[PDB]
Amino acid sequence: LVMTQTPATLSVTPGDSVSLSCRASQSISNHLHWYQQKSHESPRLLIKYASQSISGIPSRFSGSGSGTDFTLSINSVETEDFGMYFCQQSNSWPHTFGGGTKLEIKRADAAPTVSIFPPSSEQLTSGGASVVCFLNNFYPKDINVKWKIDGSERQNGVLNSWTDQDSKDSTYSMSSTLTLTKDEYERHNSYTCEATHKTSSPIVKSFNRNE
Amino acid sequence: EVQLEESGGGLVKPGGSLKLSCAASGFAFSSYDMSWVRQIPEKRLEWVAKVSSGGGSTYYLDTVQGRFTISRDNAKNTLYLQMSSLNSEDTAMYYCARHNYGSFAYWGQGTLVTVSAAKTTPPSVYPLAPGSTNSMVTLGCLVKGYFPEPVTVTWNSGSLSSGVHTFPAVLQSDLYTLSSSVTVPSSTWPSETVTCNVAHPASSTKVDKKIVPR
Amino acid sequence: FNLDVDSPAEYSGPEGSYFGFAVDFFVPSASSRMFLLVGAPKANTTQPGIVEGGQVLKCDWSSTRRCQPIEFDATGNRDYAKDDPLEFKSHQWFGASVRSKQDKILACAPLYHWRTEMKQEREPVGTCFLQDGTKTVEYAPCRSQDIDADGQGFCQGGFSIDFTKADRVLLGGPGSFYWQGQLISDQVAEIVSKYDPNVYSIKYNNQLATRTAQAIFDDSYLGYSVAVGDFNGDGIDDFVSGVPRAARTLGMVYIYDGKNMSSLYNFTGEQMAAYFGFSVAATDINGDDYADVFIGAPLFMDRGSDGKLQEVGQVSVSLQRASGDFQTTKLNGFEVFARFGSAIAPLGDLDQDGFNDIAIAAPYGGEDKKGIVYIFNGRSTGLNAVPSQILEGQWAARSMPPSFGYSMKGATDIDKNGYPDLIVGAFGVDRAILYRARPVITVNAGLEVYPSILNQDNKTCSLPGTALKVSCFNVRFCLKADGKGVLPRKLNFQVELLLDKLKQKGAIRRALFLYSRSPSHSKNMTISRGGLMQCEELIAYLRDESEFRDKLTPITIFMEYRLDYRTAADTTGLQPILNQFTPANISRQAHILLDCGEDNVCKPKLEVSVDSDQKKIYIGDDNPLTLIVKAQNQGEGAYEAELIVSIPLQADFIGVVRNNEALARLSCAFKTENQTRQVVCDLGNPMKAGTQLLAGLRFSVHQQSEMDTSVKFDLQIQSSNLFDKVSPVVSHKVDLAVLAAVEIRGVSSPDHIFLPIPNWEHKENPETEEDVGPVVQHIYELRNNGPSSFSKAMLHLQWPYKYNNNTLLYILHYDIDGPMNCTSDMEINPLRIKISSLDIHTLGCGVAQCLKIVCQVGRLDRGKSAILYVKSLLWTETFMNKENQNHSYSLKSSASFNVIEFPYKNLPIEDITNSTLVTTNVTWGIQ
Amino acid sequence: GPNICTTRGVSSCQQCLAVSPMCAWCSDEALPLGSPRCDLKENLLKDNCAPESIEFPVSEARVLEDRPLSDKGSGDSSQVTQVSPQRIALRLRPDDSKNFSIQVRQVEDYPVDIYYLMDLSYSMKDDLWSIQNLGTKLATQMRKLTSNLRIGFGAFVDKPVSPYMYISPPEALENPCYDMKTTCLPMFGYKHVLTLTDQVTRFNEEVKKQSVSRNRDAPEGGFDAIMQATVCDEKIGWRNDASHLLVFTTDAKTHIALDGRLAGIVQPNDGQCHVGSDNHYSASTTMDYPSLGLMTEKLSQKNINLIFAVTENVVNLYQNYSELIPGTTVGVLSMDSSNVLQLIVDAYGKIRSKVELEVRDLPEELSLSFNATCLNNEVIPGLKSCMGLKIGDTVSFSIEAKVRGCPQEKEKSFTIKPVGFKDSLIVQVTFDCDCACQAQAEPNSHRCNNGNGTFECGVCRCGPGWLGSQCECSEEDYRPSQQDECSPREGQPVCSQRGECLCGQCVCHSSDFGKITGKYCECDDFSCVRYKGEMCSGHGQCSCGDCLCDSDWTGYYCNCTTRTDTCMSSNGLLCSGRGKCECGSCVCIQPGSYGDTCEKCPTCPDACTFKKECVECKKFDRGALHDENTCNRYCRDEIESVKELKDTGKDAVNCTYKNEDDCVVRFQYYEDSSGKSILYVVEEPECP
């Protein structure tokens, strides 16, 4: 048995309504459950047995379907509805889950706050050099971050991490770390962090090793 | 109220063994079926094993069977998962869960299992301070080269909670790196001290790093 | 019989809801207006998200047929999560069972399901909705932490319902504890006062329930049917609980003390799958203030005249006694598959005659299987099993038939007259019918003739159209319109007078009336209030002697009645009916004077004597007795001559013997009239002097009990004559006697034994059967062949044992049955035979020293067998002679008896004695 | 001359036929009120009525069709015939009867249609596995009973409704056994899988393809499954020219009619087929269970025998249900069901050991009395059946078809059939009570000489108001003349008490509590003998004090039934084979047996003196059973010879007897060898 779950990602403005669809390769009667998973939290039963809701779960969440095709609809999505959703089949061994849908909440565009940090003296002592760039409180999640060393684009050694969408403001933060060898670091003067984002014309932050 | 707490996760060398426990309270433990569900790094959930209320019937994922054992002690209100012959595919957050007729009605918090030949390494913690003015100033700390996950970061031992953003770890060649930022009023820094506090349980190492001006 | 089917109040609801599953009658203290309750299990309603929840509708019986829902609720499923039923109000069958008292209506949903916060399991708990005035309460003691089938999760509270006197609620929950069942009982007052809507597991302080039973009772269904009544003497009504699959599918009914769930009485069905307990009802049928239990068993299979099994349905009647020893009768359906045991319900007093009674439903009976309901009155000794009237469905199956009477209620006076109706459900038609009872009038009519003996010469009446005079007589018509309850003060009776009924049919019209000049007259009589026996008088004309030859044939005068209807009915169409046991055919015979001498007075000389063909009646059987009765007429003749004999019921009259030409053939009646038992022969109306009528009156005398030493018959002949109407009584006695032949028989199990038994060897101290020898069981029996039973006898056994000094037969065990006790002189089983697991030739008791065994034999019924078996071993040492080879032997015991005492203490008694020898032939076979 | 109808039928041509079979009545003025009337055929015949004007019908027994009875079941082409008469013509007169007979043979090699209806509850998973070798093996053993056997298959799992089914409390019970690390099927009520086929190897494969389901309610849905298997001929594959064996295999108690109330199922079961195109009972959620009554009628009407292949711990209910489902049989099933082969072969042999007749559509006024030839030429009265037959043996029933009174002029078909047999005897019955001259009559007022009356059968008949010997003395008054024979021997009553002579006929003036019939007011409808306060206990009608019994009753008091189930024993034998039946009860047999069926006989010699008689003939060719050619059916015990009578340690009776050859034979009689009687006879009796 294979559980196909679509769509994989979903961007929903508050007050708008959405639905997820679950497809099973064979008939699973009504033996399909739905779960929600918020950041750094465990999965929670939303709807059990295709349409039976649970106890402190909002009416806005309504499951439907039988056999091979099931839905989970959410009327008027709220900010707190952000997070992953999963269906699970309990018909036949092994139990299986769908791929999962990442529900995101749409909000006003927000330009990032970009801050550039030079290598600490402590890191330079051990022979390394990491140039760090923080891009906080922005929306939409899609941002292009480039590093320029003496004006030349660098890919090697650059590591990014995005936070999951914030439960209060529905914004994103990301962190871009450019890691080099101390001796390579000492061969260049200007280190710049470039962020291309809607809302603008890239945002640039720079540090000069000779300053 | 149902309480589920799993423990015993950690770094295990491939081909090794590990026992997970999950304590339970707030309910008639012996009246319900118990399951282990794991969340693979791709964020996919996978059911691993089920044990019946009386412990008589035990079902396992086919790619797990013969290597894992699920068992329970109904007097001790504790569920177990004894793993052996572990591969890289077994790396995951393991969650115990209570059943409601095929659904997993209640879930634990999760115990992380890392299957890898890499050795336990403490993080090196570096300050992020601005290069040599506004109403607010952004500071941080770089937590580099630790293994396995997790790592915990607080600012001023939990006193500073506003303005804090801790980034998910990025794995680069058997080592994880994360960063954490904090925004504070420009008028309070360096007038007041801002310290990054880093905990790494797998190596029992805790590092306090003061952010000083450059 | 007074239940009409002409103007019933017909009620119905929306198609497919099954209105008619349960019915009831609501009579609040609040008003003079009462309502009928009709449950409808599949009904759809307002409650959002709920389908086929079921509903009970309240209906105004006074026209205004619209039924309307009882507002028990309006909301959707109780929530927990939003739109997640915590209780499933859908597909639950509300109205499947409905009951009420005063201003409280408690409706059931046996398929009400719950969710328990503990586990996601839907459970068929079954609950009720209580409408208290305008306050609504959920009644569900069945809902608790006992979440599943092991517990109360499957009670399905609601298949059966009732209330006790005062206010306790009886909720049957047949699915409880793996369908063992449970009867749930609580005071409705506590249910209403201690209810908290945020808790669905409310326990009540006075809550009672049948305790969990052993696995032995799995699938018994206690709670499919329930009733109440004063079974354990006085105090609180007990609970009558039907448990149809108890006793291995035969079914049982349990009576539990109202105050404590512990069985008081237990009744069972005789046939598998009859479903004894489908319908349990209780009523004081005899009018003696104690409820009985009537148990319907609708699938009951009876046996027809051809041996076939016929599904007719049974109603098992257990009639209460002060001792708790229930007496019983059975009612059964007539037609096949007409499941008569489907419903039993109170009717109350259908004639206001002092008896409480019931009606029985056979829902699938009738050509076009509409359902038939059987109505009959109660009696001081039971039920009148034969319906006097039935109610029948008037609707065809839409799909499934209406099942009339499936559900039923009665013993309520809905209209102004105190004659109760039947509310008969018909769920397959979405209907329920109110069959009303008409007032019942007992009309006592009487017909008298003053000049009962006529003289054709006394021409004293003037015929109005002639100068001639007429010999005539005065015929009088009286009426008593008695009735109870509410009936019009003035009743209208149509009465017709018929003269010379037996001659108008093609013969000469011997008599006619003076003014109408015809053999008939009629009038409409107004009879008011009851007891006002007003009357009319008509004068009859005896036809001229010059034309009509009759002299002896009686003139018969008849009354024929009809009680009218429109002119004696209420404005509601509630027409009166006359009592079903009251005749509308009343008559008098008149005669023309014949012989009677110069004085014109018949002076009969009536005498009777008898010849007994058989002098004795044996006690304990049906002994025929024929008495020849000789009726003499030594004086003048007689008018309406009859033979009257007073006969004890134990002497069951067959008739007048037709097998002897020497005897007259007299027609003869058999009756019981006002504490009598009587046989009456027809000696001929116009009896003439010198007539001699002899006839044989044949009786079968049962009298099996310890009765008098003779049977007495009191005989007289009589007439309606002017003088000396009755002969002297001849009192005839037939001796009664004790006849108790007893046959003594017996046999030795094997008739013979062969000496070369394999592996049979001597031991100094033998053990086990194998070292002693063959086991012989000797049976002795006293059988009572004669009709008379007895109180005491002895059975005397002589067991030959020591031949010379050789002990032959060792008695292993005395297997004694019947009222029998053996005493031995000699030690029995001296050899310690722990075996169990079961004059040379004749070794008689006059040869071998024998053991003396005397068995006392107690009271034995005729046909009873009193048995004594002696199990014994033949010991090798005492058969394997040492002196000179061996001998064939006849081992012979002797059983003698003497019957000493009979219960028939006042009768001649003879000792009954005899004896039987029982032997085995012991030989070697091979030499 | 003057015999019965002389006074009872003279007033009506129909009445004289109603009164007696010996009466005739002439027409066309053959004897124009000569003097005698009706009398006997012979008196009128001699008194100038010899010509066929006598209107004298007779009763008749004729056979319309008699296709000969067959010897072998595979003898196809001409339909294999199990009974001798096929169509019978019966002509009755009132209060008369005719005899016929029914020869029934247990035809050898008769084809078998067997359906295996299985319990599909989880405890049977291993049964389905064991059964993988059946079909092929079952048919193979059955090849000895018949060369043509077909095997089908179906199953039951109970009604798929809330209280039976695990309710689908969650989804988890939509496809159950998720509870125990396995999978199993949902509840379906009744399923049909394989129709009967000669390709019995299909069963082996079809059962392997099946698997079990889950039931919460322990009671089985077996009664819906039996009824549908019994009723749905079109899918089950029952061929009329074959025995139909419905095998019901189960490990549990069944659920019955009106128990269905728990699921909201209150619809009466009409005993109809509800299996659709999906080979599934669609009525499984709306109809209740069939009753024992419905099962009995449908399996009897359609000739289906039921075999209960039931495990040991529930047999008490199945045996008791069969007592209430006549014609069926119940055996004991092994937990691994390996013995269904043997269970069925013996069940078949048991079914065929009984011959029993049933008459369908029998009217209220006709009584069919039977005397059954159970052995040689001896017949036992009150029997619809004979026990102890082997395949190839015959049974011969003697039937008396009697009619009470004068039932309506319609032809009725009385179907007399053995139960389980397709072949039947159709007796076509008519009632000849109508004088042809009753119809060939034109009363027309006039024609009764000078008068106004009616006319029938060659003479005039003036009714009330005209009467007289011909047409005279309207209302007596001309009456004081003519005398006439108003009473036998001229004893001079006016008319036997209750009546008066009127111009050649008597008139009865009485009109109370009944009717008076005949010329001399002879017949008193209300005067007869009572049994228990009622003339002949309400089980017949009276005619002139002579009670005419109703169906299945006899005697002067109509107090004796012709019913024998009340005297029948648990072993199927009337009076247990040792006693005589009388008035629904039993007459004690000389040795001293007693009870309703002669159950107890404590002074009776031990069985060894009754069992030796069987050995003495079946093995030694001596004894009463030899001379009477009876042992072969009488003794159905298994008798084996042994070299030694061993210490078995079980319930073996040590029997012994000295033979005609002065030899002593010992044998053991063993009880309950899995229900059978086994005798062990020593090979070497002792002798001088």
Q: What is the per-residue DSSP string for A148-190? A: EETTEEE-TTEEEEEPPPPTTT--EEEEEEEEEEHHHHTT--E
Strand pairing class (A128-138; A113-117): antiparallel
Q: Which residue has the tokens 């859908």?
A: C90
**Residues A152 and A91 placed together within one structural domain of the fold:** no
User: Residue A31 and residue B46: Cβ atoms within 8 Å?
Assistant: no
Q: Please classify residue C539 by burial: count the beta carbons closer than 10 Å to its beta carbon, then call 0-12 exposed, 13-18 middle and 19+ buried.
A: middle
B interface test, pick of C120, C147, C150 with most B CB neighbours within 10 Å: C120
The domains found in chain B, sorted by start residue, are 1-117 (no CATH), 118-213 (2.60.40.10)
Q: Which CATH class is domain C606-737?
A: mainly beta
**Residue that is last in its domain, among A107, A128, A148:** A107
Instruction: Write out the two tokens for D594.
Output: 């007693």
Amino acid in position C426: A
Q: What are phi and psi of D14, to 5 degrees?
A: -70, -40
- Domains in chain A: how many in total? 2
Q: Would an 8 Å CB–CB cutoff place B101 in contact with chain C?
A: yes
User: Residue C925 and residue D686: Cβ atoms within 8 Å?
Assistant: yes
Q: Would an 8 Å CB–CB cutoff place B35 in contact with chain D?
A: no
Amino acid in position B199: A
Quickly list H helices, C304-392: none
Instruction: Write out the two tokens for C854.
Output: 């005397």
| Burial C447-477, CB ≥16 within 10 A → b, else e | bebebbbbeeebeebeeeeeeeebbbbebeb
CATH number for the domain harbouring residue A81: 2.60.40.10
**Residue that is last in its domain, among A107, A127, A149:** A107
Quickly list H helices, D547-630: 608-618, 624-627
Q: What is the per-residue DSSP string for A26-90? A: S--TT-EEEEEE-TTS--EEEEETTTEE-SSS-TTEEEEEETTEEEEEESS--GGG-EEEEEEE-
DSSP letter (8 states) at residue B174:
T
**Residues A72 and A122 placed together within one structural domain of the fold:** no
Centre a 10 Å sphere on the Cβ of residue A186 and count the other Cβ atoms it contains.
12
Handedness of CA D553, D555, D558, D564 (dihedral sign): negative
C83 chain-A contacts, CB cut-off 8 A: 53, 59, 62
- My answer on whether omega of the bond before D363 falls inside 30° of 0, hence cis, is no
A58 chain-C contacts, CB cut-off 8 A: 82
Query: In terms of Cα–Cα distance, which of C414, C419, C397, C338 is closest to C3?
Result: C419
- Enumerate residues 6+ apart whose C-beta is below 8 A from D303: D243, D244, D419, D420, D421, D422
Q: Please classify residue C537 by burial: count the beta carbons closer than 10 Å to its beta carbon, then call 0-12 exposed, 13-18 middle and 19+ buried.
A: exposed
* Consecutive H or E run containing B124: strand B124-128
Instruction: Write out the two tokens for D325.
Output: 């489902």
Beta strands per DSSP E along C164-229: 168-172, 183-187, 208-209, 225-229
Q: How many CA atoms lie within 13 A of C252 on its CB side?
A: 17
Contact between B2 and B98 (Cβ < 8 Å): yes
For residue D268, give the 3-state DSSP assignment.
coil
- The distance of Cα C786 from the centroid of its chain, to the nearest Å, equals 32
Nearest CA in chain B to C147: B31
Q: Considering only the C-alpha atoms of chain A, give the largest distance between any 2 of them, rounded to a whole number of Å.
A: 70
**Residues A116 and A155 placed together within one structural domain of the fold:** yes
User: Rounded to an integer, what distance in angstroms lies between the CA atom of residue D370 and that of residue C681?
Assistant: 40
Amino acid in position D576: S
Q: Which CATH class is domain C440-592?
A: mainly beta
One of 4.10.1240.30, 2.40.50.140, 1.10.8.100, 1.10.40.30 is the CATH number of D605-687, namely: 4.10.1240.30
Region of D361 on the Ramachandran plot (φ > 0 left; ψ -120 to 50 alpha; else beta): left
User: Rounded to an integer, what distance in angstroms lies between the CA atom of residue D215 and that of residue C130?
Assistant: 34
Range of the domain at A179: 108-209
**Residues A158 and A192 placed together within one structural domain of the fold:** yes
**Residues A30 and A64 placed together within one structural domain of the fold:** yes
Q: Which residue has the tokens 């065990």?
A: C813
* Consecutive H or E run containing D137: helix D136-142
Query: Which subunits count as partners of chain B given 3+ CB pairs below 8 Å?
Result: A, C, D
User: Rounded to an integer, what distance in angstroms lies between the CA atom of residue C782 and that of residue C785?
Assistant: 9
Q: Which residue has the tokens 């465990």?
A: A42
**Residue that is last in its domain, among A83, A107, A131:** A107
Contact between D383 and D358 (Cβ < 8 Å): no
- CATH assignment, D109-352: 3.40.50.410
Handedness of CA C377, C380, C385, C386 (dihedral sign): negative
CA torsion, ordered D571, D574, D575, D581, to nearest 10 deg = 170
Query: In terms of Cα–Cα distance, which of D537, D528, D544, D529 is closest to D558?
Result: D537
Contact between D23 and D4 (Cβ < 8 Å): yes
Shortest Cα–Cα distance, B60 to chain D (Å):
9
Chain A / chain D CB contacts < 8 angstroms: 25
- CATH assignment, D58-108+353-433: 2.60.40.1510
The fourth-level CATH superfamily of domain D563-604 is Laminin (2.10.25.10)
Strand pairing class (D329-333; D304-311): parallel
Nearest CA in chain B to C145: B28
- Residues 93-152 of chain A whose Cβ lies under 8 A from any Cβ of chain B: 93-97, 99-100, 113, 115-120, 122-123, 126, 130, 132, 134, 136
Contact between C554 and C521 (Cβ < 8 Å): no
Contact between C858 and C903 (Cβ < 8 Å): no
Contact between C724 and C604 (Cβ < 8 Å): yes
Q: Which residue has the tokens 């696995």?
A: C215
Q: Do domains D109-352 and D476-562 have the same CATH topology?
A: no
Cα angle C169-C171-C176, degrees, rounded to a multiple of 5? 145
User: Rounded to an integer, what distance in angstroms lies between the CA atom of residue B89 and that of residue C557?
Assistant: 116
Domain boundaries, chain C: 440-592, 606-737, 742-923
User: Rounded to an integer, what distance in angstroms lies between the CA atom of residue D353 and that of residue D145?
Assistant: 13
Q: Which of A32, A50, A92 sits opposite D183 (nearest CB)?
A: A92
Amino acid in position C490: K
**Residues A166 and A94 placed together within one structural domain of the fold:** no
Query: In terms of Cα–Cα distance, which of D259, D282, D92 is closest to D163?
Result: D259
User: Rounded to an integer, what distance in angstroms lies between the CA atom of residue C710 and that of residue C736?
Assistant: 5
- CATH assignment, C742-923: 2.60.40.1530
Domain boundaries, chain D: 1-57+434-475, 58-108+353-433, 109-352, 476-562, 563-604, 605-687
SS3 content of chain B, % helix, strand, coil (to 5): 5, 55, 40
User: Residue B58 and residue D181: Cβ atoms within 8 Å?
Assistant: yes
A interface test, pick of B1, B179, B210 with most A CB neighbours within 10 Å: B179
**Residues A132 and A193 placed together within one structural domain of the fold:** yes
DSSP letter (8 states) at residue C686:
S
End-to-end CA distance of chain A: 62
Q: Would an 8 Å CB–CB cutoff place C119 in contact with chain B?
A: yes
Contact between C153 and C182 (Cβ < 8 Å): no
User: Residue D172 and residue B101: Cβ atoms within 8 Å?
Assistant: yes
Query: In terms of Cα–Cα distance, which of C138, C71, C134, C148 is closest to C109?
Result: C138
DSSP letter (8 states) at residue D344:
H
Nearest CA in chain B to A90: B102
- Enumerate residues 6+ apart whose C-beta is below 8 A from C792: C856, C857, C858, C859, C899, C900, C901
Strand pairing class (A152-154; A144-149): antiparallel
**Can you state the angle between helices D292-301 and D222-231, rounded to 10 degrees?**
20
Contact between C585 and C658 (Cβ < 8 Å): no
- Annotated binding residues of C for Ca(2+), written as ranges, equal 230, 232, 234, 236, 238, 284, 286, 288, 290, 292, 349, 351, 353, 355, 357, 413, 415, 417, 419, 421
Method: cryo-EM
Query: Which subunits count as partners of chain C given 3+ CB pairs below 8 Å?
Result: A, B, D
Contact between C658 and D545 (Cβ < 8 Å): yes
Inter-residue long-range contacts of C834-838, CB under 8 Å, 24+ positions, other chains counted: C834/C767, C834/C768, C835/C768, C835/C769, C835/C775, C835/C873, C836/C812, C838/C775, C838/C777, C838/C812, C838/C813, C838/C871
Nearest CA in chain B to C122: B101
For this experimental structure, what is the resolution in angstroms?
Answer: 35.0
DSSP letter (8 states) at residue C641:
-
The fourth-level CATH superfamily of domain D476-562 is Laminin (2.10.25.10)
Amino acid in position D629: N
**Residues A68 and A133 placed together within one structural domain of the fold:** no
